[PDB]
Design a binder for this molecule. Structure first.
Ligand SMILES: CCCCCCCCCCCCCCCCCC(=O)OC[C@H](COP(=O)([O-])OCC(O)COP(=O)([O-])OC[C@@H](COC(=O)CCCCCCCCCCCCCCCCC)OC(=O)CCCCCCCCCCCCCCCCC)OC(=O)CCCCCCCCCCCCCCCCC
Ligand SMILES: CCCCCCCCCCCCCCCCCC(=O)OC[C@H](COP(=O)([O-])OCC(O)COP(=O)([O-])OC[C@@H](COC(=O)CCCCCCCCCCCCCCCCC)OC(=O)CCCCCCCCCCCCCCCCC)OC(=O)CCCCCCCCCCCCCCCCC
Ligand code: HEA
Ligand code: HEA
Ligand SMILES: CCCCC/C=C/C/C=C/C/C=C/C/C=C\CCCC(=O)O[C@H](COC(=O)CCCCCCCCCCCCCCCCC)COP(=O)(O)OCCN
Ligand SMILES: CCCCCC/C=C/CCCCCCCCCC(=O)O[C@H](COC(=O)CCCCCCCCCCCCCCC)COP(=O)(O)OC[C@@H](O)CO
Ligand SMILES: CCCCCC/C=C\CCCCCCCCCC(=O)O[C@H](COC(=O)CCCCCCCCCCCCCCC)COP(=O)(O)OC[C@@H](O)CO
Ligand SMILES: CCCCCCCCCCO[C@@H]1O[C@H](CO)[C@@H](O[C@H]2O[C@H](CO)[C@@H](O)[C@H](O)[C@H]2O)[C@H](O)[C@H]1O
Ligand SMILES: CCCCCCCCCCO[C@@H]1O[C@H](CO)[C@@H](O[C@H]2O[C@H](CO)[C@@H](O)[C@H](O)[C@H]2O)[C@H](O)[C@H]1O
Ligand SMILES: CCCCCCCCCCO[C@@H]1O[C@H](CO)[C@@H](O[C@H]2O[C@H](CO)[C@@H](O)[C@H](O)[C@H]2O)[C@H](O)[C@H]1O
Ligand SMILES: CCCCCCCCCCO[C@@H]1O[C@H](CO)[C@@H](O[C@H]2O[C@H](CO)[C@@H](O)[C@H](O)[C@H]2O)[C@H](O)[C@H]1O
Ligand SMILES: C[C@H](CCC(=O)O)[C@H]1CC[C@H]2[C@@H]3[C@H](O)C[C@@H]4C[C@H](O)CC[C@]4(C)[C@H]3C[C@H](O)[C@]12C
Ligand code: CUA
Ligand SMILES: [Xe]
Ligand SMILES: [Zn+2]
Lengths: 75, 258, 513, 40, 56, 227, 72, 91, 44
């Protein structure tokens, strides 16, 4: 892993949804693996991609909203 | 003159209207920023005085003085159509804002439409009733038009009264809707698009209803002939415009956007 | 009698005179703002010591020149004076509504000068983009007063558009088809259609900005799901038609001036000139996103906007070549108005061609938000509009006033102005190519030489403006009353004398089929 | 264009006065503000 | 109601030199003065407000 | 960076800026030629005592006046659009860097592996080291590997800004709530300068961009030292 | 003619309004309000409103419109 | 049911004058385009006027975009300076 | 209303020197205004 590869779902200059989708994907997968006592290494691809693409302040705001119960995406 | 056009007497109403615009805008500024409604209420008063006296004079010039030859009437027809076109393009801007927001919902909304936490109105309840009301009022205003062309005073007044009653019913239903809505103008872009688009539409319904009421009183005073009644035609065109904007709002915001 | 005539007017000529006076006054304001801009940039470092005030000066400069100088002069002034005369009509369709289009402009201007005097002004650019124009980065009344100034100007021009379209469609002689109306009348009709369709979209967008600033809407605020780029689309959907609004009446005046001073009865290729203006008007609605090539839109969208934008060169070239073919074989009269019109054709062509450079999205990445854009529009808009206005002013001044100008003084004025504008704007191309951003109060040291020259140019144009006022004074001071003009057989606006009586065409023209 | 002789001809001297007053009306107020920018 | 348009046509066509905004009689004069006083006074008040708002 | 008395573009540092230089040369030749032809024909129309003032037939000449411009526009559009599609063309970046605009400075995030981030402020004129450039120097430069495809993601934490580096052919608006992507590839080491290119208030003139392009080994040493 | 348009008014248009009125009146009961969640994209306050305490929307309904801090 | 006034009953001022003149096939307010004669010296176009001169616009050939404007004076017929068509003023 | 040269304007051209005063005040006020607004903002 060097950086997030080209993703044909997000081929344009606006990459907002690429960051968002990988953040959701990581947290949905982390919930599925924890809720069984499973293994979060399965979620690693999504973690590396969102960490690469997403502004630190977006990740930090989303994290705070998940802990507050105000995150508006479905996890 | 040996042309058929109207040389208008020098008039103060353009200047009083221009100053009413200054007072309403400086008044909104002084309400939003300086905690005061004074200028705004003066501007609203001078705006209503200006519109009353200007359109009174147009009635004096036409019904009482005979200045509306066929050539003048043709100009007024073009003027009202061009005015309605400018109002269509105004609404187009709000529809553009609605489709921009709803077709590409941002992550702050939950990346979905309607946004997370928004409970839209059921479009089959009061919004469907509002649709039947304005469509019915388009039928009754057409009955009024035909009664007037056929020389039938009683049925013109009955049809126009029914049209106005339906306009008022829409306005009271929308007022009630506004109060019962569990979302507000501050509920993000969903509230913003809903209240600004339907709010400008409700303003046009009140304007349209007011125009129909002017036509009702002019008809009671025998101003219209079976052949010459442009104020009635203009109010009917404006009323159909208000109906058609509603149908677009209903399909776009209430139904497709729910 | 004075208040009845000048405050309660229902006369197209008097209202045209009010618009010309208003526009000339606004031009002094806009010129003063332009000289403050070039004084700040005239040497490296800070002059005003306040970059918020610099940004307010730049913003006001543009609003004054567009909304209070060009549109009032071209449409309110020449339009109201000439359109009824050129179609033999006794006035405008809505002579009282016409007076309200005029009287909305002083209040509009007052709201703009209030924006600049309260808080720290609206230092937004004339585009007023959020979030800079929002209630956090521009807290206070300044931006709201700018929005209201635009509302009043917007209502003035929408009602004026309704009046011109109705007048031109409904008030010609019954034998005169639309294909027997003069090109200036076509240019006003088409401008009025663009105003009618574009200003309501601007009104929707700045109303959304008002509600985001004051009613807790979020049309342009990502926190509520809004999008700053939506404002840009609404603004430029108006803004591109607006630049064609600013030049089209100038195209009409240039057609009349070139025809007149070539000693011709008619412009070359009349139906081609009508086609070209209608084509430019139509295409002007489908190109707006060339103002947005750096905001992150899709490559195919950039390809479309590049291609559509370049198409406008075709009808535009037909007009340029048609003006040249009107000169062809003329008995040329080297009047000052002809000099303005020839200056127009050349300077408009240069600016139009830098437009075609900018149309290329790829190159636009490097030229966007640089002085190359500033150079482009000061050629095509600033010099185009101004040269067309000065040509129209010196041509029709004797019609409006009954008095002649001193032609030698008017030629001196032209010569000074031609030197000044070229010395001011030509070097801005170099500044843009070499990467100097627009909307800057100061610049890296490398950009000093061309900024210095540009600022020296701005003072030469000031000398021309001061001379222009003197020349107008000398004409009213000397009172050389017009007797005759040539070519009245193809210039109906002259046929009632100079100035024409308060009421003209009480008895309409006789035109048979 | 043809015109009657000037009803009230403006001599070279009258033009120098007109030009001078015009230029001063532009230059003096702006000059006063720009000269005092330090004091501001 | 009764059709009294002919009586209003006679009033508004009387050869008395009045402009149409005043031809109805003394009530027109009163409404005009109220309108123009509120407009001019309101405009003077808006300038005062500008003077106030122009300083901290 | 620009130099005194410069007329044209900064020397190209990237292959796409090279393509833009060659495309501008082609287009400028056409601008010159058309400008010159219009001025020439004006002088030609104005320099003869010969006259023809009767009605002229326009139909034949208007074919020439529409077809020749249409051909010229196609000859500009073909290479313009080839370059447009080249700067969109899928590439595999080896590095992603974020930049966030602020009133009035840039921050940079290198979060491919480490959480590295820092702010980048204009050096005031009173603090410039001898020989440093007024309005262009920053305290913390954007360290990047040369000869490698880099993905830059641009956004804002407040108002609009625009992240520009003329010598690389780059300009991408910085919009809050939006992540705009561009590709960066430097053919050379060195320092490459740019300036905020969307009006963002009083200090718009004073929040520059400085890239520092170094061989990959030195980029990796710099990254490692940052832990 | 007028006779036809009156026929449509009374025979189709007003009967439609009567049926939609019945539909509306039958579904008019108060819905149970949802749990309050202080979502950051809702109850926006960038400037106080220019009426009341600055925190109430113009047609605020206590039963169904929570404030930023929740139901009154 | 009646009760709506007709134009015949209630039109007034210039509207009524236009209405009454159209019933008689007259056009005192210049609503209609006049039909040209052959325009020869024997058959000139007859230009009504309430005064001793009136502006004539001559569309010399159908579909000409250029209209030729001139004052036509009381007295001997005048000719369009572009096509030579004759016009005679009839006060 | 009065008709003819110098009579179709809201300002008098009866006296060229009074005209020069009025034109000077008219265009001079417009040109001065931005200098005095800048001064006003700087003195804040
Ligand atoms: C009247 C009022 C007063 C005039 C205003 C005063 C302005 C100052 C004059 C500028 C002189 C520049 C200079 O120092 O020239 C030295 C310069 C020295 O040559 P050089 O530096 O080796 O240039 C070679 C570069 O590689 C060349 O490559 P580059 O990449 O360095 O060159 C690109 C650049 C360079 O362009 C130029 O070389 C100069 C522009 C030509 C002027 C016309 O110019 C532009 O792209 C300019 C954009 C212009 C837009 C459209 C212009 C329409 C022209 C109208 C035609 C009328 C015909 C007459 O000589 C000139 O170019 C002469 C000009
Ligand atoms: C931010 C605001 C935006 C404002 C924008 C301003 C620009 C727009 C200008 C539009 C023009 C407005 C005209 C409306 C009526 C004027 C009212 C007035 O005061 O009259 C005095 C004044 C004429 O003075 P006069 O020579 O004594 O004439 C007296 C009558 O002949 C004999 O009649 P009378 O004896 O019955 O009555 C005359 C008497 C009294 O008459 C009355 O009883 C009238 C009372 C009500 C009048 C209210 C006027 C409202 C105007 C508002 C703005 C528009 O007037 C006076 O002598 C004293 C009045 C002083 C009032 C000041 C008005 C100045 C104009 C605006 C200047 C801007 C200042 C802003 C400062 C900025 C600070 C940051 O009228 C003018 O304002 C005319 C314009 C000034 C002369 C400039 C000449 C330039 C020539 C260049 C030619 C380029 C165009 C080519 C035209 C083509 C030829 C056909
Ligand atoms: C009078 C006003 C006016 C006119 C008429 C135009 C005309 C054109 N403009 Fe310009 N423009 C502005 C005023 C105007 N513009 C303003 C004010 C801005 C900046 C707004 C802001 O950001 O503040 C601007 C900005 C602007 C941009 C955005 C640049 C950026 O911000 O990065 C672009 C992009 O495509 C554009 C292109 C054009 C084109 C292609 C034309 C065409 O219509 C030109 C067509 C004319 C010709 C081409 C010349 C004549 C033709 C011939 C002689 C025939 C032969 C020619 C060829 C074969 C090429 N202009
Ligand atoms: C019609 C529009 C127009 C006109 C005429 C002008 C005229 C001038 N402009 Fe510009 N300008 C703009 C429109 C115009 N401008 C716009 C839209 C912007 C962008 C704002 C933004 O970024 O948001 C701009 C920005 C702009 C900038 C860039 C600021 C920056 O990016 O920081 C500069 C820099 O030099 C400039 C300079 C000038 C100068 C020196 C003049 C003049 O001094 C040139 C000489 C012309 C005159 C002196 C006019 C004379 C006319 C009259 C006085 C009327 C007479 C009336 C009658 C005869 C009836 N203007
Ligand atoms: C019943 C049917 C219709 C009712 C009409 C509305 C009544 C009051 C206002 C009148 C003006 C309406 C026009 C549209 C403007 C803005 C918003 C109006 C829509 C409305 O009334 O929305 C209300 C908010 O009003 C608000 O903020 C307060 C709004 C009051 C101040 C508005 C000021 C804005 C004026 C803008 C002027 C621009 C004009 C454009 C000119 C263009 C020219 C080119 C919604 O209530 P809420 O509590 O949030 O949610 C309901 C919760 N139970
Ligand atoms: C409670 C109120 C609060 C809200 C306030 C806002 C304003 C509300 C106003 C409603 C509009 C009332 C208009 C009344 C016009 C009456 C004059 C009229 O109707 O005039 C007629 C001409 O029409 C004409 O000018 C046609 C004139 C058409 C006017 C068009 C009106 C639409 C105006 C909209 C206002 C702006 C909306 C924009 C909002 C952003 C006269 O000709 P006839 O009818 O042929 O008569 C002659 C015959 O009798 C002869 O036999
Ligand atoms: C933020 C707050 C800012 C808002 C400020 C609003 C601005 C100004 C205050 C408005 C004051 C209006 C007073 C009444 C104006 C009535 C105009 C009218 O009705 O004009 C008529 C013509 O326009 C016609 O018909 C058809 C056109 C009728 C137009 C009615 C006026 C509407 C004004 C607002 C419209 C904006 C449009 C919305 C789209 C963006 C009549 O023309 P006249 O020349 O009078 O007479 C001709 C004679 O032959 C008649 O016998
Ligand atoms: C001949 C013409 C007659 C002119 C008379 C003008 C009419 C009103 C004059 C008094 O001015 C008012 O005074 C109130 C204070 O004394 C203000 O309260 C305002 O401030 C309150 C704050 O307590 C808020 O509730 C409201 O914005 C508002 O009432 C109110 O806004 C403002 O209009
Ligand atoms: C962008 C357009 C600007 C173009 C520049 C105009 C050209 C200069 C015009 C003259 O302006 C004046 O200059 C004087 C200086 O020459 C100033 O006197 C100032 O300086 C004098 C001498 O130093 C003192 O005696 C005075 O008291 C003092 O006010 C005076 O105020 C100012 O009106
Ligand atoms: C006939 C032509 C028109 C004539 C115009 C007449 C103008 C009337 C002047 C009234 O002045 C008012 O004074 C109030 C008290 O001084 C202000 O109250 C407001 O400001 C107060 C400051 O004490 C606050 O308590 C509140 O926001 C509010 O009461 C209010 O803004 C202002 O309008
Ligand atoms: C772009 C610069 C100039 C372009 C000029 C194009 C002018 C075309 C003129 C065509 O007019 C014709 O000239 C012929 C006599 O020579 C006539 O025989 C013919 O009847 C006439 O129609
Ligand atoms: C009695 C009177 C006659 C009208 C006349 O010829 O002057 C009639 C004719 C039409 C009547 C109106 C229409 O029937 C419609 C309405 C019917 C409602 O029941 C009363 C109000 C209402 C608005 C009526 C008022 C009044 O009774 C009117 C105006
Ligand atoms: Cu940041 Cu301009
Ligand atoms: Xe507007
Ligand atoms: Zn003829």
């Amino acid at each position: 892993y060097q950086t997030a590869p080209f993703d044909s779902r997000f081929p344009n200059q606006n990459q907002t949804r690429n960051c968002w989708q990988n953040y959701l994907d990581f947290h949905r997968c982390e919930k599925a693996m924890t809720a069984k006592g499973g293994d979060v290494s399965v979620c690693e691809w999504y973690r590396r991609v969102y960490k690469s693409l997403c502004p630190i302040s977006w990740v930090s705001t989303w994290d705070d909203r998940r802990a507050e119960g105000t995150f508006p995406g479905k996890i | 003159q040996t042309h058929a056009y109207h040389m208008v007497n020098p008039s103060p109403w353009p200047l009083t209207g221009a100053l009413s615009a200054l007072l309403m805008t400086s008044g909104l500024t002084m309400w939003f920023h300086f905690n005061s409604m004074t200028l705004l209420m003066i501007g609203l008063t001078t705006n209503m005085l200006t519109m009353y006296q200007w359109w009174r004079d147009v009635i004096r010039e036409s019904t009482f003085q005979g200045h509306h030859t066929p050539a003048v009437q043709k100009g007024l027809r073009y003027g009202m159509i061009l005015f309605i076109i400018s109002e269509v393009l105004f609404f187009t801007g709000f529809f553009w804002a609605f489709y921009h927001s709803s077709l590409a919902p941002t992550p702050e909304l939950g990346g979905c439409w309607p946004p997370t936490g928004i409970h839209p109105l059921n479009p089959l309840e009061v919004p469907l009733l509002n649709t039947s009301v304005l469509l019915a009022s388009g039928v009754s205003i057409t009955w009024a038009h035909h009664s007037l062309m056929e020389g039938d005073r009683k049925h013109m007044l009955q049809a126009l009264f029914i049209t106005i009653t339906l306009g008022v019913y829409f306005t009271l239903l929308q007022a009630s809707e506004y109060y019962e809505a569990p979302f507000t103008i501050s509920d993000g872009v969903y509230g913003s698009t809903f209240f600004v688009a339907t709010g400008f539409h409700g303003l046009h319904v009140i304007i349209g209803s007011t125009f129909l009421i002017v036509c009702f009183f002019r008809q009671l005073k025998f101003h219209f002939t079976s052949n010459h009644h442009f104020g009635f035609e203009a109010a009917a065109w404006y009323w159909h415009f208000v109906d058609v904007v509603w149908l677009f709002l209903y399909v776009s915001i209430y139904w497709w956007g729910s | 009698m004075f208040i009845n005539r000048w405050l309660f007017s229902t006369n197209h000529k008097d209202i045209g005179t009010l618009y010309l006076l208003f526009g000339a006054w606004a031009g002094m304001v806009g010129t003063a703002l332009s000289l403050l801009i070039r004084a700040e940039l005239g040497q490296p470092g800070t002059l005003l010591g306040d970059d918020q005030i610099y940004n307010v000066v730049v913003t006001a400069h543009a609003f004054v020149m567009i909304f209070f100088m060009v549109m009032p002069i071209m449409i309110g002034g020449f339009g109201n004076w000439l359109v009824p005369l050129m179609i033999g009509a006794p006035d405008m369709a809505f002579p009282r509504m016409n007076n309200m289009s005029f009287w909305l402009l002083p209040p509009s201007f007052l709201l703009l000068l209030a924006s600049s005097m309260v808080e720290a002004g609206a230092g937004t650019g004339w585009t007023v983009y959020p979030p800079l124009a929002g209630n956090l980065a521009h807290a206070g009344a300044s931006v709201d007063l700018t929005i209201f100034s635009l509302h009043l100007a917007g209502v003035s021009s929408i009602l004026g558009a309704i009046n011109f379209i109705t007048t031109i469609i409904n008030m010609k002689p019954p034998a005169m088809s639309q294909y027997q109306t003069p090109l200036f009348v076509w240019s006003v009709m088409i401008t009025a259609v663009l105003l009618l369709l574009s200003l309501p979209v601007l009104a929707a967008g700045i109303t959304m900005l008002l509600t985001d600033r004051n009613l807790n809407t979020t049309f342009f605020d990502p926190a509520g799901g809004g999008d700053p780029i939506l404002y840009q689309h609404l603004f430029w959907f108006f803004g591109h038609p607006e630049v064609y609004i600013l030049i089209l009446p100038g195209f009409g005046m240039i057609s009349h001036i070139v025809t007149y001073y070539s000693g011709k009865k008619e412009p070359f290729g009349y139906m081609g000139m009508v086609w070209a203006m209608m084509s430019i008007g139509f295409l002007g609605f489908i190109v707006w996103a060339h103002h947005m090539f750096t905001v992150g839109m899709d490559v195919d969208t950039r390809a479309y906007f590049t291609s559509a934008t370049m198409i406008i060169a075709i009808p535009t070239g037909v007009k340029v070549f048609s003006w040249l073919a009107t000169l062809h074989g003329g008995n040329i009269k080297w009047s000052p108005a002809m000099m303005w019109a020839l200056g127009f054709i050349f300077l408009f062509t240069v600016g139009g061609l830098t437009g075609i450079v900018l149309a290329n999205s790829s190159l636009d990445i490097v030229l966007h938000d640089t002085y190359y854009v500033v150079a482009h529009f000061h050629y095509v808009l600033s010099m185009g509009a101004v040269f067309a206005i000065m040509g129209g002013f010196v041509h029709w001044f004797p019609l409006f006033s009954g008095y002649t100008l001193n032609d030698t003084w008017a030629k001196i004025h032209f010569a000074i102005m031609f030197v000044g504008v070229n010395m001011t704007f030509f070097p801005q191309h170099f500044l843009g190519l070499s990467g100097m951003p627009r909307r800057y109060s100061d610049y890296p040291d490398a950009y000093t030489m061309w900024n210095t020259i540009s600022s020296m140019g701005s003072f030469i144009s000031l000398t021309a403006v001061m001379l222009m006022v003197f020349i107008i004074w000398e004409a009213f001071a000397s009172k050389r009353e017009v007797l005759t003009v040539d070519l009245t057989t193809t210039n109906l606006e002259w046929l009632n004398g100079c100035p024409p009586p308060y009421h003209t065409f009480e008895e309409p023209t006789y035109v048979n089929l | 264009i043809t015109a009657k002789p000037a009803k009230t001809p403006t001599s070279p001297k009258e033009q120098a006065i007109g030009l001078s007053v015009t230029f001063l009306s532009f230059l003096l107020p702006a000059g006063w503000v720009l000269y005092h920018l330090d004091n501001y | 109601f009764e059709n009294r348009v002919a009586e209003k046509q006679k009033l508004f066509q009387e050869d008395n030199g009045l402009p149409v905004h005043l031809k109805g009689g003394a009530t027109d004069n009163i409404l005009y003065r109220v309108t123009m006083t509120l407009c001019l006074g309101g405009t003077l008040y808006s300038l005062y407000c500008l003077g106030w708002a122009s300083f901290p | 960076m620009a130099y005194p008395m410069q007329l044209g573009f900064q020397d190209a540092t990237s292959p796409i800026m090279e393509e833009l230089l060659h495309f501008h040369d082609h287009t400028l030749m056409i601008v010159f030629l058309i400008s010159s032809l219009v001025l020439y024909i004006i002088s030609l129309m104005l320099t003869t005592k010969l006259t023809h003032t009767s009605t002229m037939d326009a139909q034949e000449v208007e074919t020439i006046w529409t077809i020749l411009p249409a051909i010229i526009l196609i000859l500009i559009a073909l290479p313009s659009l080839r370059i447009l599609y080249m700067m969109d063309e899928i590439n595999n970046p080896s590095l992603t860097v974020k930049t966030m605009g602020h009133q009035w400075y840039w921050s940079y995030e290198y979060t491919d592996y480490e959480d590295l981030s820092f702010d980048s402020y204009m050096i005031p004129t009173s603090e410039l080291k001898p020989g440093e450039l007024r309005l262009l120097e920053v305290d913390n430069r954007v360290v990047l590997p040369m000869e490698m495809t880099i993905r830059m993601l641009v956004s804002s934490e407040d108002v609009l800004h625009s992240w520009a580096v003329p010598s690389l052919g780059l300009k991408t608006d910085a919009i809050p709530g939006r992540l705009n992507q561009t590709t960066l590839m430097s053919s050379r080491p060195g320092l490459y300068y740019g300036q905020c290119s969307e009006i963002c208030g009083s200090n718009h003139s004073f929040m520059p961009i400085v890239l520092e392009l170094v061989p990959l080994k030195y980029f990796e040493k710099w990254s490692a030292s940052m832990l | 003619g007028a006779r036809t348009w009156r026929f449509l008014t009374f025979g189709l248009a007003l009967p439609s309004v009567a049926l939609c009125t019945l539909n509306s009146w039958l579904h008019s009961g108060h819905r149970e309000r949802p749990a309050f969640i202080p979502y950051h994209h809702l109850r926006i306050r960038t400037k106080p409103f220019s009426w009341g305490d600055g925190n109430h929307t113009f047609f605020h309904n206590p039963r169904v419109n929570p404030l930023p801090t929740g139901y009154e | 049911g009646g009760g709506v006034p007709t134009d015949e009953e209630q039109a007034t001022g210039l509207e009524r004058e236009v209405m009454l003149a159209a019933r008689k096939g007259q056009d005192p307010y210049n609503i209609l385009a006049p039909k040209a004669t052959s325009g020869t010296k024997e058959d000139p176009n007859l230009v009504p006027s309430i005064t001793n001169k009136r502006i004539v616009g001559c569309i010399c050939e159908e579909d000409n975009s250029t209209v030729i404007w001139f004052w036509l004076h009381k007295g001997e017929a005048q000719r369009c300076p572009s096509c030579g068509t004759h016009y005679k003023l009839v006060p | 209303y009065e008709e003819g040269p110098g009579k179709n304007i809201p300002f008098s051209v009866e006296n060229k020197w009074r005209l020069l005063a009025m034109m000077t005040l008219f265009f001079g006020s417009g040109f001065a205004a931005p200098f005095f607004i800048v001064r006003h903002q700087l003195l804040k």
